[PDB]
Nucleic acid binder design. Sequence first.
RNA 1: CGGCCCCCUGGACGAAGACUGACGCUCAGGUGCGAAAGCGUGGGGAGCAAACAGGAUUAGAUACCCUGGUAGUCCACGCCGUAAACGAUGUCGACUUGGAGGUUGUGCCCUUGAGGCGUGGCUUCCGGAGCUAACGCGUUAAGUCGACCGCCUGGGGAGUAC
Lengths: 166, 129, 74, 240, 70, 58
Amino acid sequence: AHIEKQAGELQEKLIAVNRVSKTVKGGRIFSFTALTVVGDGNGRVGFGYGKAREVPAAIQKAMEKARRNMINVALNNGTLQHPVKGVHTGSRVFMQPASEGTGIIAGGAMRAVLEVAGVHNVLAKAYGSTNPINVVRATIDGLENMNSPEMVAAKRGKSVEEILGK
Amino acid sequence: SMQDPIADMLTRIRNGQAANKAAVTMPSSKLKVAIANVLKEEGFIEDFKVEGDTKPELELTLKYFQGKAVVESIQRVSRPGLRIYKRKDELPKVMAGLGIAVVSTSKGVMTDRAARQAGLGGEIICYVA
Amino acid sequence: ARYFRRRKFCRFTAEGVQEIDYKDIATLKNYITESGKIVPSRITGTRAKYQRQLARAIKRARYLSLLPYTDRHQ
Amino acid sequence: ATVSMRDMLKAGVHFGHQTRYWNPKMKPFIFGARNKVHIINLEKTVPMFNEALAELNKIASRKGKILFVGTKRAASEAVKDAALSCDQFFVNHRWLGGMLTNWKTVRQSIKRLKDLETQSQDGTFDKLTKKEALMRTRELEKLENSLGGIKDMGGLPDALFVIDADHEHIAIKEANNLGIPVFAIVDTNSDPDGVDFVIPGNDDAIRAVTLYLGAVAATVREGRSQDLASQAEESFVEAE
Amino acid sequence: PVIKVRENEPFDVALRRFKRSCEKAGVLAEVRRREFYEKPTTERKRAKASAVKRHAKKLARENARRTRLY
Amino acid sequence: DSITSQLERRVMFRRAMKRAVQNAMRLGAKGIKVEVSGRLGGAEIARTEWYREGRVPL
RNA sequence: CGGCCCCCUGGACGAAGACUGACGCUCAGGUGCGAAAGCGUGGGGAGCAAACAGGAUUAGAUACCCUGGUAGUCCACGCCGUAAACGAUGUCGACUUGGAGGUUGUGCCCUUGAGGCGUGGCUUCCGGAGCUAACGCGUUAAGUCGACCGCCUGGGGAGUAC
């Protein structure tokens, strides 16, 4: 939709779902919380934390915040040449340029998440907090600056940005 | 007090770009000129000047693309006490060659691609990210 | 016309009165009430130097009975 | 036209004040103080004012809907006057938070207002008790005042006309997520930072702020007029 | 601290405000407590602290107008 | 009657009440309240939930 | 670091003219060195006070509160320098939009404004680029960095053991 990458129909990658209440002043919260990541395999910055009165709405709200006001990010399937050294809120990730010929190893739900995120081959092991919410931020904060250049003139490319910077 | 002068050149390039400054000045040296030429042509600086009959002095103009900063960091890797030397076959690859390593060979300061192409090694001076 | 340098009412709205002299009683009384005590600097908006040398001077003077030291001597 | 330099000097010789406080990131367009009053630098303003108005004209030909936002006691008549007619919208009994992001809700509350105004004047709700009618008569007044100069607005606006940023920072932020170009008039404590085109000014002196806005408003509104006459010619050609 | 300074026209009620200029303060205020030497330097010296409220107050007058509360 | 059947038949009921409220306001009237009880989801406590929307005077 | 003063003496702040010309940085060990009270002997000792009594409180002056009341507090010299040794933040140095207050060297000004502008000084409010979990910092960093040092690696038990 709009300024978004060439996804076709939506990814519906639900990682978690929960229900939270203080129950301090007028009974419990009936509302649910939801975690969803939406990519396209080619690179997106889509990540959505949402909440609603009930579970169907919590997930659908969370997915809506994951597909609106997202830039397309233009990496070549699973290969990327310029990641960022990811930090997001104490949860730390460390991607580097890499073959896709080697495959991807990751425990828990992360080998299914990294693939729809399109950043799976470049990833290397996390450190810091192991919260689900901020560990998957590899394709969001790890692309806040990036390129994946295919031109043979790649080292005169930054030269090309400089004479436009004059 | 002054313990690394290519680190001081670098932080001036970094901070120059963070404060939107047009030019950045410091004392000059032979290493600083040989680098500033490789930096001009690969456009990691825009231009430079050299001046002073009494003592030499270095004037530089920053890298842009659109008008606000586009270089994340420029940091030195071989330094006072951890000098790092690389052979011809093990010269690094910096961001699939979208970035540069600036490389002092026995034949001078050049990029890692011309250093590889001669088949020399040497001290690998400073990296972009 | 140029270079007047302290005619009157110029630099500052309140004058610095004495510094460190303590043999005149009336120069001191510019910052001492009849109740017999020194004024806070906050209240006058004095600058701190002229007040600091005066603290010293007012005490040199107090110890020689050129002034009353204490309210019980009014 | 040269006219953009004439309004800017005639207004700008107020030099502001805003006591001695101000903001360091505005520093270039601030001339040094004459005894603890701030002075605006006009000479640095003449490229600025000319940059801003030239970009206004190009969106004149593109738009149906204008929003004048940022209103205040000293700015109310100038914001009323800047619109002149019902293709240009303005809020003067205040902007409220989410007036564009939740426009769904605004179009519902306009539909409530115009419904109770035709009921009220026909007499339709005046039955039962006088209390039940009077608490309604008052809420209808309150809608009538709040919405009066925006009630007809058929859609989301093309541009944002900001006359002060100090108190209306949310309106700027949310226009940016809606991807709308901002045209800003800033005081000394506001920043030039983070918005697309600036007029450096000051928020005091009711005589300057009536004129800055009048120049800006004339530009877009009369831009649309001459573009509009061209637009007509261009379409009647298609059927001939 | 009825204050020695004489009130214009004498009366049985002292005009205690109009008499005092800097009296009781520091001198007859710290009654019946253990006297410290240097504590005032960190305890009392809140001049910096009061200078912030005076700036803030001079800022907010312009800003209530800009909000249209005024 | 229509809502009670879902529960009767051990169907998941994830949205069912929320759609009851929605279809009723889509077919007419000015407001609805629904409150559902009977141990929701199979909980071993009493567990109610409810949804009111539009105007429902009490 | 505070009566006031003198005797002995440091370090810092401005400013011009001149001089030498990496003579630099950091620093285990190290010698020297105490806020406060501890403390040995000589000189001295008004009030307050651990302790101790008794009152009062809620069963502990030694939880809470008061009154008496002793070593102490005070000085000279002499012994190992502890802590909340800090904007809880090592050092020194290079670099990064500034405005204004308190207040000081000093060019200029009804020095008309503890003000302005010109340029340094500590000190303090304010917030940008950037950084932070959060408060918060931001040219006196918690920013960009530089070198070298100190120091930490789950809690209790242990700041003791050894």
